[PDB]
Design a protein around this nucleic acid. Sequence first.
RNA 1: GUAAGAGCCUAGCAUUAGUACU
Lengths: 273, 171, 16, 217, 60, 108, 49, 318
Amino acid sequence: DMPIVCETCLGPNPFVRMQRIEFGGTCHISGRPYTVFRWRPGNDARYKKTVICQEVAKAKNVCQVCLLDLEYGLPVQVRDAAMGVKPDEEPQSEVGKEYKLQMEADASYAAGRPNEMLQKLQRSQPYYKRNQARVCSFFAKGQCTRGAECPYRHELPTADPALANQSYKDRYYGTNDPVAAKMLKRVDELNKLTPPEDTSITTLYVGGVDASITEDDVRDAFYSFGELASVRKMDVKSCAFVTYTTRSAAEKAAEELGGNPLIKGARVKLMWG
Amino acid sequence: RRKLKGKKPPEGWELIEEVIEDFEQQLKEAVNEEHEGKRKTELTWKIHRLHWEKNRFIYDLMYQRKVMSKELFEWLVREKVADGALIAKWRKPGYEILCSMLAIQKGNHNFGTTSHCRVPLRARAKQQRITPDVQTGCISCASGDGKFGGPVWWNTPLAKLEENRTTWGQA
Amino acid sequence: PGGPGIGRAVGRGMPA
Amino acid sequence: LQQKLLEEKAKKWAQLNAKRYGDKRKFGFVEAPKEDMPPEHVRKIIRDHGDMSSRKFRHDKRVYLGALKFVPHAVFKLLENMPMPWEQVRHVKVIYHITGAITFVNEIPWVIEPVYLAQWGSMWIMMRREKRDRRHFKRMRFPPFDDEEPPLDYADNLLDVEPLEAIEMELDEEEDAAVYEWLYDHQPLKYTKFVNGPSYKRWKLPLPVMAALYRLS
Amino acid sequence: KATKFFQSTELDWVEVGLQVCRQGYNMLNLLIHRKNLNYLHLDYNFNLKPVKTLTTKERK
Amino acid sequence: LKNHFVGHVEDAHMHPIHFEQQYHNFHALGFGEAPSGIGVVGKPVRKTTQERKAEQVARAERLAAPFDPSAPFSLQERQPWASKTEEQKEFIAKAEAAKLEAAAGPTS
Amino acid sequence: VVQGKLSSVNPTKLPGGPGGSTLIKYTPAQQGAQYASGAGQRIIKMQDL
Amino acid sequence: KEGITRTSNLSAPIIQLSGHAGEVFSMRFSPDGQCIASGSFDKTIFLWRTYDENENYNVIAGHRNAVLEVHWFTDGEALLSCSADKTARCWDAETGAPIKKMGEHTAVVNSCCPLRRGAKVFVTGADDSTVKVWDMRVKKSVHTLRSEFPVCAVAFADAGDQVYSGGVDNAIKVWDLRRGGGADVEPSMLLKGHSDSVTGLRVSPDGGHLLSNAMDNTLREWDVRPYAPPNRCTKVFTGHMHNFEKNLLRCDYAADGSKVACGSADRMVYIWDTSTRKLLYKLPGHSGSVNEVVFHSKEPIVASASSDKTIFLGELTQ
RNA sequence: GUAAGAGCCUAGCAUUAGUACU
Ligand SMILES: [Zn+2]
Ligand SMILES: [Zn+2]
Ligand SMILES: [Zn+2]
């Protein structure tokens, strides 16, 4: 009766004219005939249509269009990784998938605390630039006569060449989805604060600390991950020294608090002191 | 053929005859052009623009100069030389340079609208301000928008009138 | 001259 | 207020009550029926989608095949509207698919029946004169065209051929004067006071006309 | 005629008939070449000719 | 407890001017009315009497043109409209020729 | 059910025009002042093609 | 089960009236409370029974555009319909025939109110900024006053000598018709306090109070007693809504002056207790803006009309 | 001698979603 859609994939307009093509397509996952919806998110947009069944949509809490999760807008991998949940059991076969469907007809995503991981790795404002014309394939080959009139983007494709071959079923299930792979390697580096070649440096530098955070407040921060050798304030730099007694505790404190944690609101950075 | 069979055309037909036959020759060769290298939607754009210009000659003489007789015009409409519905429209206020009757058929359009070319170019968004209609090739046939007395077709510089439309006149 | 009207009993729907 | 705003506020309420209750906007409004295209439109659509063997029109193949269940209807509609031996050309109303997949003759061959019998009685007479008077009647070869050649292009081959004379009886002026200037028209009295109107239901013919019709017939 | 997929004109009958013949030919050949029977063809006079000599599987 | 799956879908009934008018105040202009009745949304991005008169002038001028009832009309222009960065794409197409020709050590 | 089985399964039923617009008011799960450009709900013109 | 004190004789406590094919812009209960006059955007008037079937026993046609406002005449057998097709029409209810169609206005005849004590006379205020008074038996309009801004809502006072008109001009005016037999009379009373247009006007069951709904999303209650304070403003109500629709949203008093019902654009039927100035009922169920609400003459029944082509017809429990 | 199928190489039907950095 209404698509299950990412609210980015409805564009800025509070009013939406959308075309409703009942039996307009086959679900890109369950291969099922379903009701397609087509619309132009905004004036700079193209016409996007739903890509999957409504059920196959609301199973994995993903948009019918972008196949991204509905709460955070990250691919189904990145959300399944932060959800920590098992690999997809759902049958890849379509005899299997339709059998699972016809079963579930005749007779876990809404009750989770907001994962900081997903929240940390998500876009603040909407990726409206995802609702925009493809790139003019005749502009690429240099043979576009349509001039600036082309409804297609007059730019060249600037994309990872292992990407641009993404599979629907794999972006919906979560297997070898190169975009979420790139994203998790990003978070792998950001979760990779370099523990230096010096093994004995047992201090962590805490920079960017706004003044209302006190030294015992950052002590309340860092006591959990190991014994503190000494904590040292200097508000002139808005920064702090924290030395521990064991290296692995400062390793813990880097690994958990490297991806920019916020102590009582202050966006603070960690470095190996 | 319809005019060429049997009967006589009313008085005046000798003035407009060569121009009408020229317009029919142009439409005859538009139908015969080759379509490789251009969109599927643009097949009929030249046909629509030429149909417009032909009926605009008939309109120009019948209602703007009024050098055409009611019986000659009614003959041209009856013998299918003039599009009677489209010339009839151009008489309506607000439809003065309408490009095609397709543009205002509302069952013709997905959302039950007229076409975006009927919308004054100002009140449109930059997306629908340089794209010609996919059926007619008209960018703007809103009265007020018209360059050179006609619509803003796919290639109408928003140059000189002579380079952008057929200019019959009486030499 | 009964017209094309009907009255049927229906609850009032609620948004929550 | 003070007409420094109340001017445009009142004018906006005025124009909105105008637009909301317009004649294009009101309830029983029906949109006007579709007008005809120029024939060059379907002519070109059908010439370009020539034999449906290009990649450009391939997403049209589905609908083209889907037109097949309507091909009996189109056949019937074409053949019920075939010209009659006294016509050289019949222009015929037609609805066509936007792709060129089917064309239907959107006409019915409505005849004033006494007129139609006069017409075919003339045909009878003149055909028998010709079978009599003609030294050698060469019959058409069937099939008229050979199995391998593609059907003609009308635009190319028939659009500017001037047809030929059709079969018509030389009607005696001063005796057939009643039915003389119009017997061999396609729909002979379509724009006169002798039919209900151009929809060509309901004739009403005078007495000398029916007399000539009965005689010819 | 009301459907947005049909338009209207006036054509010479002979033109519509040439149309209707080309269209029925196109339909029936699309049905042949859709069933993947690329060893048959319909010619222009509507005879279905095998362009080969067919096996019983193909003949079937 | 919600209606649709990701929110509440509720029937609406307006007069058709209002959908279109609001959809195009925001759609084209960028800024329009919130459909909830709460303010406005977003950020913003005629004709005359001398000009009207001058167009009436040009109309009456085309009327003032002499008509020669002897003369047939000719068609002079006869189809003028019909007969009618690059740098990055140059470099890209160079890369295309490169990856094209490239499309077409051991030691002891 | 019987009229569904008769009509839905009957194919001579001539197909026709566009199923008219129905308005709906849709209130999202996630409404923030960035989604719908700071507007709360959405009106959707649902046009059957 | 649930046995909550059936008030009325209606089969159910909430009845939806369907059969219209357009927005329903104004409705009215018969003086004897067993008829419904519903005027739709479909330029048609449905006549419903209030009991035992809710049968629309007649659909009267004859307006060429939306019938914006309907009242009944004091005896209940004649109906006054006002429209957008510039034509107000008097009909006979039992019969299905139109009696007198006066079309003297130049633009949409938004508002009308027939006089409840005296002769068969009704006021009509339209888009031409002119509020005209119309006596039944003459075929000319008996009075014609000219404001400068299009008239949205008009009412005829309880006693029968003054006319209340409110519109886009931010102030509602009371005019005296016997004081004016001339063509450019100046207004008698200027009730100010609404911050923009007025949409609906109802005369109180005692005649001392006038209800004004405003797209100031505010219901205001003024007193019309010729001996008043400097500010005739008495009451303010908050809660309903007006949106871009700018529909003709009206007022009503319960037959006892105990409640006040407003139509709103948030699809809600609002019913305040006049005294405490607070919200008694906030009834949902309408899919379009609620255009006018009418309280049944005898019982506490409230019936609402919406821009969703239906009319809910039900009783109040508390 | 049926004629069925498995596969190998090469083998022209359907799709419009997705491409981020304190
Ligand atoms: Zn989405
Ligand atoms: Zn391009
Ligand atoms: Zn146009």
